[PDB]
Each structure stands twice: as C-alpha cells, then as structure tokens.
Design a protein around this ligand. Sequence first.
Ligand SMILES: CCS(=O)(=O)NCc1ccc2c(c1)OCO2
Ligand SMILES: [Zn+2]
Ligand SMILES: [Zn+2]
Length: 580
Amino acid sequence: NLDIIGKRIEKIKQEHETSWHYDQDHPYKTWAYHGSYETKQTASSMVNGVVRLLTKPWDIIPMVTQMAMTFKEKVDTRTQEPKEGTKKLMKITAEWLWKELGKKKTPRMCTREEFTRKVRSNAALGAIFNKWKSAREAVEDSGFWELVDKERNLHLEGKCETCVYNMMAIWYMWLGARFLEFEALGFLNEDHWFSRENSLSGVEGEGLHKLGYILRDVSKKEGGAMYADDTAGWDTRITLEDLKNEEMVTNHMEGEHKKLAEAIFKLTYQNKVVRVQRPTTVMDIISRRDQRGSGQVVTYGLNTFTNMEAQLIRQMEGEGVFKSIQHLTVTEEIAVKNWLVRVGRERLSRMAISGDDCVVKPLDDRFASALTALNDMGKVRKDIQQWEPSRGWNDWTQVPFCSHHFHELIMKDGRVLVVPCRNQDELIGRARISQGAGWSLRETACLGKSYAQMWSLMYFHRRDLRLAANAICSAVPSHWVPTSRTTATHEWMTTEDMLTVWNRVWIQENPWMEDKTPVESWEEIPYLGKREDQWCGSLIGLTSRATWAKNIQTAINQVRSLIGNEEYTDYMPSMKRFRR
Ligand SMILES: CCS(=O)(=O)NCc1ccc2c(c1)OCO2
Ligand SMILES: [Zn+2]
Ligand SMILES: [Zn+2]
C-alpha cells in the first residue's frame, strides 16, 4: 500500500496544500480514496462539412445523424480472486506463452530517438498539456529529459514520484511517465511480438484487407463452430494474478532493462494513483492494485497476451486436459505442460486475437459449455447468462471480428477477394465526424480525403461508398495530402493513384492471390450482389440515392466553390455510369 504510492500522493498534496480535504461523501467503494482538491474544467464530436455536403441522402437517416450528437459504475467494481487450480493453469500457460513469443525475438529498450520520432509524426501516446505546450516542444527541451532522468533513477531505486494516471475510460499520463513505459515495454509493439508470424493467434500489423483471409484460413481447420464471445468490460476484469503473469516477460530481460521493466509493472501497473473529475468540481486522488490502466499500445499487447492465455485454457477445459479449477493434481500439471508442448502451437493457430477481441475454432463443440475457467478468471461473456453455452458460427463469413464481417467476392476474371464489411450507416456516420478545434477548411477537406481513400481501398465493393469516395476525391484538390490527428496498416494515407495502391494491396502483395495480373481499370473491380449491398445498409433503389448519384457533379461543384480556385481531377468517369 502507501509505501509504494505515498510519495506520489505526498507530492500532489503539497501542490494543492490550500485545498486538501478528506471528503466524507466520496462515492468510491472498490477504489482506495486519499483526498480531494480544487479544480474547474471539462471535447464534443464536430461535423466534417466536406463529407456531409457529399452524403446528402444520409442527412435524413437517424443512425447516421445521431452519431454526431451528445460506464463509470463498471470501473468501480471488484473481481474475486481465482481458485488455486485456475491460478496454476494461468501461471503454467503464461510461462509457456512468453517462451514461445521469445523464441525468435529479443527484448530490448526503446530509445529517446525512437520516442522523439514517434511524437514528431502524431501518434496518440495519451500525454497531457503544465510547463511546455505540446509533446513536440517537451521532446526538444533538455529540462524535460532531466525530469525523465530523475524519475528513471527513482525507478532503478524501486520508487516512483510523478507516474500518476488522469481518468476521462482513457487514462492519460504526463509525457515523461509515457516515455519510461515506452522505454521498458515498447519493444512488444515496435518489434511485432503479436504479429501472426510470431504469436500464431495475433494479427498485430496485419491490416483490415488481411483479416478476412486469416478467418477463412482458421475456417479450413477440422473442428467445431467458430466462437467469437465478447467479454463484458475486459479492462475492468484484469486481475492482480493477470498483472503478475504479464510481468513474467521480465524473466526474459537482463541488466538495466530488467530493472526498468520490473518498476513499470510494480509501481505503475500493479499499484496505480489516479486523479478524477467529480462535479460535486474537485479532483479525487484514488488508488487500486488491479484492472488495466496502461498506455493504449502496451494495453493492446498485454490484452492480446492474456486473451491468448485465457482462450488456450478454455480450449484445455473443452478437451478435458483438467477436471476441476478447484485444484490441479501433480499429474494434471504435467498433462497441461505436455498438452502445451505437444499441441499448444496448433491450438494458437486456431485463433485470431486482437486485444480483447477473439475468434476461436476449437477441436470440437465441447468448448461451447467449457465455462468454469473463463468465469473464474473473471472473463465473463457479454449478453448471455453466466452458465448458458456459447452460440457459435457455422460460416466464417458471418463471424464478427474487429467491428467487421467478411465477404467472399469473385472477380469477373475468376480470382477471389476476401473483403472487409460493416453496416454502411456506421461507415458514413464516422466519416462525417471530426475531433478537436481549429480545423481550417483545407485540413477538414484533407480528413474527408483520408476517409474517401480508405473507402476506395477497403469498401470499394459497396456501391454508395465507391461513388461517395470518387465524389470526395473529385471535390478536394488533387495534390492535397490526406491527414488525420489520431493515427493496423494505413495504405490509403498517400497521394499515389488509388488504382495503383489497390493493385499493390489486393494483387501484388496479397499472399492468397496466385495470379498477379494487374487490374487496368476500376470497372474490373467487382461489387457485392445488389441484394447483399442492401442487406449491409446500401441506399441503392431509393429515390433520394438515385437523385444524389444523377446530380453528383452539382454536389462536387458546391464543395469546389467553397474551397475556391484550386487544381481538381474528375474521378467520376472511373465508374461506368459517368463514362458517357
Ligand atoms: C454501379 C454503380 S451504381 O451503384 O450507381 N448503379 C447500380 C444500381 C443502381 C440503381 C439500382 C441498383 C443498382 O439496384 C437497384 O437500383
Ligand atoms: Zn514513476
Ligand atoms: Zn457486409
């Protein structure tokens, strides 16, 4: 308790000595409370005018228009200690999994140089505003690095002063604490520990154009249904036993790195200090030992790790490797170890795991009712009763993964595309939203262009999105560079011709495409069936959509008149209906 977190608490106390009060009407039950102090402040979603003016039919669709308008009683819950059998299953599995992930990789520290480059190219590192304005300024000023140095030597000493979370559920830290996290644990992401090649279950770096092909490869295995169970609030169900199995990656480290990594896990992950906005407006300084509250990129890799572990154990339960979670007998331990050594890698290859999101094709359907370990680890399924067997999927094209489903699409020349899809109202509603202040018209146009190029590359098979993408690319000056403020692979972020990028992604670099004959025009690139396009939210067949398509040059010219006298290209004649 207070020996590890007290210093951080002590320091915050003295910075607000005029306001410190141990409030008695504090709402916390599962968080340890320490005190309050005086503050007063809060970032709503803004509309992208360029995308909205070129998507007029969706102005009257509430599922689109409501997305631009507008659980902290789940963070204040507790997770029971797993049983002795469960804790043993997790420890054996975690030990084995870190070794497999480590066979072809070397843990190493990430550099000030690597960190500096990251900040000088807009990556959502989740820092705060004070002493310097932005991340860019702090990184050039040598004073920062002396503060970083002071904390760094404190961590080597086994102590912490400034590594404090700020709730808003996204936990921002100051850039310094973020650096020390990245230096110790960035290697998991920077060196692709959760690539499919390295982890067998993972999809880190894979790209939305690969995920369908990966699910179709899992479908080819002999076994039962495909299970895709969502966890209810994964980050809140991370136990202290989970955080200790994750820390075992430090067993693979040496020297300084081992000590620096050990301090991130001990001082910031397995003990936390957080400041929260309460409107009754004070700042509450609360602590807890468990739950996930790391940088979003370390969170992704450790979520993937612990999800891989949890699903191998659920597979062991289905296959009868152990009888009960109450207690592992000495000979069950050797059977579990032996299962891992004998079939562990095969069983990883039966899964696609993206942080808290999984798809599992088990050996058979005993998996569906193998719920004792999953429930006792705290990984309780969403939208199904605790002990009701899982509903599996019989067809890989129906399975949900990373907010998508996947279609098999046959080109007029016989070649097979596996394409990503989701309800079209979600895609159009997201492209009509921006975040943050001070957007110029040019910056808004360049964000519209990023969405349009993503649609041309990933959702070309949706009639409405290929037309809207062509319209936006026609309305934005041809040489203006697509932008984003918060940055999977992003091949649409480019000024290269989108047909050339489509050829590179879907033909040249596609390992599931044997014939490498380039496509010569957009008209060779197919759509979903008309009925399937409607099922997935198309407006084809509506009067509003027909008027929009017919009159699209008038909408393009409205946006061109607002942006002014610039160089534009007409992309509409890439589509048959606008080709005379
Ligand atoms: C290929 C470019 S397009 O999407 O603009 N034309 C196809 C189409 C238009 C109207 C329809 C339809 C299909 O089915 C019902 O009404
Ligand atoms: Zn610290
Ligand atoms: Zn679809």
